Symmetry: C4
């Protein structure tokens, strides 16, 4: 269970990196307009 | 205590998945 | 400390609701284009 | 154990604040 907590924390962090990378690409393509 | 925390984490994760779906729809509207 | 954990979990959840509300407005204004 | 978890939470939170800044810039580019 403490392992499944540690697993979920890393899943949340990763996805937050993923999300903020997707928004960074979106910001990029709109600034080049 | 660990169970209350895990439970909330699962819920936070779910919001992230929802955000990624929004971003998928949003990318497509923008052509990307 | 367990209180400050419970406080942070609610801050993360809220902000995730906030974020997904901001993206929902953005999706709305672009679909009406 | 609580300290490792709190520590990661602070870090997750920070990403959220970064995402909100991206969304602020992105809204403005879109006129909104």
């Amino acid at each position: 269970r403490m392992k499944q907590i540690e697993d979920k924390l890393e899943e949340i962090l990763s996805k937050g990196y993923h999300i903020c990378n997707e928004l960074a690409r979106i910001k990029k393509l709109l600034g080049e307009r």
